[PDB]
Homo-oligomer: A and B are copies of this chain.
Amino acid sequence: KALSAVILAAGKGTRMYSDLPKVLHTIAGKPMVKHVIDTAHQLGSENIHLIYGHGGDLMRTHLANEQVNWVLQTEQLGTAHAVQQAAPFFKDNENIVVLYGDAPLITKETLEKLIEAKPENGIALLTVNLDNPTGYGRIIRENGNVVAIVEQKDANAEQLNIKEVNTGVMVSDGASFKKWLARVGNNNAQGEYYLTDLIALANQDNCQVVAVQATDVMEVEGANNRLQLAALERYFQNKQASKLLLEGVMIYDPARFDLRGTLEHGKDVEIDVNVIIEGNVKLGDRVKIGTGCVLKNVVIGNDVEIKPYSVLEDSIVGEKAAIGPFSRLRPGAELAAETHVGNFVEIKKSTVGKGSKVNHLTYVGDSEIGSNCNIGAGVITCNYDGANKFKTIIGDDVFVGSDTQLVAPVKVANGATIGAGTTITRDVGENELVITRVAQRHIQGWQRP
C-alpha cells in the first residue's frame, strides 16, 4: 500500500543555546531534518507532513525547496498532538511512519523492515536494546506482541532489567491513527498527549503491536545539545568512510576524513589525512589527494595529484593535471589536461589550456589561457580603477615573464613572449616579443651599514 511520513520538527532546542530551532543544526553540512526528509522520500513516501513551530521563519527559509506539507503547530502539547495536526491529511488506506527531525541517522533499511512487520490494522513499533535502559519505557512482549510499554517509575524489579526500550518511531494505517489519536488523553505527570499511548489503545482494540529492533543503537539516537550532535556527526562520518573504504577508496585515516555531500569515485583513489569533501565531488581513477585539502563541488579527472593544503571550489580539473601544494582554485576555475598549478597560486573564473603551467605566487582572474603557456612566478592579472572587471585573453604557446602585470581588458596572441617585470596594457600580437626597457642608476663604492 501507499506510504506517507510525519516528521516532528517543532522543538526550540533550548540546550543548543542557538538562535536556530532544534532540527536545523547540521550533520555533514545538512540540517538534521533534511536527512530525515530525504530518508522519508527514499522510502517512497507520497506525502511528508512536516510538523514545525519554533523558528518557523528560519525553517521556511532554510527548507524552502523541500517537498513537504507545512503543518504549523501553534503549541507543543505532546507527540500525539503533533501527529494529530497532520492526521486530517492521512489517507485511510495508506501506511504512516512517524519520525523525529532531531534523529537524523535512521536508515531506509530499518524503516523498510519496520513497515514490512506491520500487521493489518495494527502497529509496528521500532525498539532498541540499551545496556542501561534506566528512564526509558520498557517493552513487554507476550506471545510475540507488544502488550505494554512500562515506564521507569511503574516498572517492577524484573521489568526494570528489560533492556528493550520504546523509540517512539512507529507505523500504522491512516484510519487507525485518526481513530486512536482521538482517544489519547493527557492524564499524566507532564500533562502531555503522548504518541506512546497508541500501543495501549491498539491493545484495547484487539489490534496487534509488533516490535522491530533497530540493528544499530545510534540509528535511533537524537541530539538535544551540540555534544550529542557531535557524537552523531562522528558516527555518520565513520559510516560514510567505511562504505568508501569497502568500495576501494584508500582513506589513510577514516577518523580524519569528512564528507559533507556526495562523492563519486573511480578505482585506486588515495585520500590522505584531514581532507574535507563538500557538495558534489567526482574523482576519476588514480586520483591522489594530499593532506589538508578541501574540495567543494569539483570534478577531478583521471590521474590527477592534488598536493597538500590545496583548496578547490566549483572547479574542473582535467586528467593528469598536477595541483598544489598551497594552491587555490576559486569558482569557475577550469584546468585542462596535463596542466600544472603550484604554490601560492590563485585561479578564479579562468580557463587554462592543455599543458600550461602556473607554478608560483600568481593571481589569474577572469582569464582565458591557451595550451602550452608558461605563466611566470609573480604574474598578476588586474584591472583599472573603473567599474566591472574585464577579461585577459592569452593564446597558445605564450611565455609570460615573471612579475608581469596583465591589465584587463587585454589580448596576447599565439606564440608571444613577454619579458620579466613588464606592465601589459596594449594587445600583444602573434609572435611579438615585448621587453621592458629599464633605467638604472649604478653607484660604485656604496658601503652598506
Whether the Cβ atoms of B250 and A227 lie closer than 8 Å is no
Q: Which residues of B contact A422 (CB under 8 A)?
A: 438, 440
The 0/1 profile, CB within 8 Å of B marked 1, for residues 405-449 of chain A is 101000000010100111100000101111111111111111111
Whether the Cβ atoms of A385 and B399 lie closer than 8 Å is yes
Q: Is A346 an interface residue (CB 8 A)?
A: yes
Q: Which residues of B contact A438 (CB under 8 A)?
A: 422-423, 436, 439
Name which residue of chain B comes closest to A435, CB basis. B441
Whether the Cβ atoms of A250 and B25 lie closer than 8 Å is yes
Whether the Cβ atoms of A444 and B429 lie closer than 8 Å is yes
Whether the Cβ atoms of A432 and B440 lie closer than 8 Å is no
Whether the Cβ atoms of A436 and B437 lie closer than 8 Å is no
**When the two chains form the complex, which single residue of B17, B273, B294 contacts A258, counting CB atoms closer than 8 Å?**
B273
Number of A residues near B (Cβ < 8 Å) is 93
**Contact (A292, B309) CB under 8 Å given A252-B230, A403-B405, A441-B434:** yes
Compute how far the CA of A405 lies from the CA of B385 in the bound complex, rounded to whole angstroms.
Answer: 18
Q: Is A284 an interface residue (CB 8 A)?
A: no
Name which residue of chain B comes closest to A328, CB basis. B343
The 0/1 profile, CB within 8 Å of B marked 1, for residues 158-173 of chain A is 0000000000000000
Q: Smallest Cβ distance from A12 to chain B, in angstroms?
A: 13
Q: A residues bordering B, Cβ < 8 Å? A: 15-20, 25, 225-227, 229-230, 233-234, 242, 245-256, 258, 267-268, 272-274, 276, 291-292, 294, 308-309, 311, 325-326, 328, 342-344, 346, 360-363, 374, 376-378, 380, 382, 385-387, 397, 399, 401-403, 405, 407, 415, 417, 420-423, 429, 431-449
Given contacts A17-B247, A325-B328, 15 further A-B contacts (CB under 8 A): A15-B246, A18-B268, A256-B256, A274-B292, A326-B326, A344-B361, A361-B380, A380-B402, A382-B401, A382-B420, A402-B405, A405-B421, A417-B446, A436-B438, A436-B441
